[PDB]
């Protein structure tokens, strides 16, 4: 479920070959992590937005379906708005990581 999302991250981290900056987190406190995912999930769509691509929409969509349902809240967490702003590269990768944490849980 969480493992499916990794594979999808690659397709895109590809299909992309630019863009701008997304809100990313790696200071990922286990205890603040479902919030981190939500932020990631939103941001993710910023790619569909910029990309006219059909295939990547279908991909982020597949990913959201997985993620959304997996999740289905916490305290003291950082808002999305107050996250680091990284590249389409670091975001993706930083996504990959936060999925892993979910995995080991």
């Amino acid at each position: 479920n969480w493992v499916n999302v990794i594979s999808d991250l690659k397709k895109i981290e590809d299909l992309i070959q630019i863009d701008a900056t997304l809100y990313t987190e790696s200071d990922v406190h286990p205890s603040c992590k479902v919030t981190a995912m939500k932020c990631f999930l939103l941001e993710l769509q910023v790619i569909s937005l910029e990309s006219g691509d059909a295939s990547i929409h279908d991909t982020v969509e597949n990913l959201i379906i997985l993620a959304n349902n997996s999740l289905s809240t916490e305290s003291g967490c950082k808002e999305c708005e107050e996250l680091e702003e990284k590249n389409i590269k670091e975001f993706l990768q930083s996504f990959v990581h936060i999925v892993q944490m979910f995995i080991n849980t």
């Epitope: 701008a20 919030t35 939500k38 939103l42 769509q45 959201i64 959304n68 289905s72 808002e79 999305c80």
Partner: antibody
Amino acid sequence: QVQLVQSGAEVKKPGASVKVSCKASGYSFSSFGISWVRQAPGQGLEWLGWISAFNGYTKYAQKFQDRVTMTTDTSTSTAYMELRSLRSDDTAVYYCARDPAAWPLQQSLAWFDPWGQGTMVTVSS
Amino acid sequence: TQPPSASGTPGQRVTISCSGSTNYVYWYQQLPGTAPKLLIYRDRRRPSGVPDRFSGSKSGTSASLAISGLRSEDEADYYCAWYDRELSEWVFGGGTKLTVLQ
């Protein structure tokens, strides 16, 4: 191709209710959300609120929170807007728009794309 | 807060101001008898299918919609939006009717 297709023009009396619908096509209605905005004739846009087509969680605008009820039907890929105790000044075209937020926290970073044709609502006694 | 009225000649570069007191600002174009459509998001960004001509900027305590290369097709109402983090609500500029002259 993505579409939102809403219901037809309505005519209502004060104190009455309207239920506007908003049918979604071309995507996973349920992975996302719907935002409702309205426009009094010859006037501006005002956001009514929002709903996650995923969890049914909602967020109402203060101005409407007392009379709106937004819902969705995963099965018919339809969001609904219900405004009650209709008053005169509720006369307005009501729109729906896809909204990337399935979760309330995300909703602050939202954009509305695309939009339904809209649904004229006239409140006349 | 935006001017209710804006004028422009074809090929002209025009500007629409959305001011106030400071975060992110969005732009929507409502062609005459249609529903609004997303023009600009997160201040600067253009969703796919939104012409170069269209660009947004934020400066001081006020963002604006720079629309160049002007055409008649561009004749519409432009609404800026933002999210009142204090009210936890979305709010809209009052709008700016834009007339392309002929």
